[PDB]
Amino acid sequence: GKVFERCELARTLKRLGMDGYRGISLANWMCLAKWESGYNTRATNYNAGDRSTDYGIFQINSRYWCNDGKTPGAVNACHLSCSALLQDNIADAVACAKRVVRDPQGIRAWVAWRNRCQNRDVRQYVQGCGV
């Protein structure tokens, strides 16, 4: 797919109801989506340890969320192919991201968030977007 521009994405995420979903602010979703993919919807990351792979803009993991047909002991939570998470339309990626935080860990499941966003101010990511 395509790569999102910061405000291009804040508008899209706001539109899809990401502002305050399960408490997460648009800004933490934006911090998440940068340090996980650079807004690259087509982003992919392989995990040699468990053979899983993180897909799309919010790097949804293949081991428990979507099925990519090659992950050991894969659970298919969102009950969808991981390919769907690599489209220009992120509706599908947003829904698994929403799902992921519906669990106990919430936003903290993503290692990149805990390292770059957690315990920091993230208002920058949205400053200037007008949302």
Curated annotation (Swiss-Prot):
This is Lysozyme C. Disulfide bonds join 7-129, 31-117, 66-82, 78-96. Residues 2-131 form the C-type lysozyme domain. Lysozyme C is capable of both hydrolysis and transglycosylation; it also shows a slight esterase activity. It acts rapidly on both peptide-substituted and unsubstituted peptidoglycan, and slowly on chitin oligosaccharides. It is linked to Amyloidosis, hereditary systemic 5: A form of hereditary systemic amyloidosis, a disorder characterized by amyloid deposition in multiple tissues resulting in a wide clinical spectrum. AMYLD5 primarily affects the viscera, and the predominant clinical features are renal dysfunction of varying severity, and intra-abdominal bleeding. Inheritance is autosomal dominant. Monomer. Coiled coil: none annotated. It catalyses: Hydrolysis of (1->4)-beta-linkages between N-acetylmuramic acid and N-acetyl-D-glucosamine residues in a peptidoglycan and between N-acetyl-D-glucosamine residues in chitodextrins. The lineage of its organism: Eukaryota, Metazoa, Chordata, Craniata, Vertebrata. The active site is at 36, 54. Belongs to the glycosyl hydrolase 22 family. PANTHER family: LYSOZYME C. The gene is LYZ. Lysozymes have primarily a bacteriolytic function; those in tissues and body fluids are associated with the monocyte-macrophage system and enhance the activity of immunoagents.
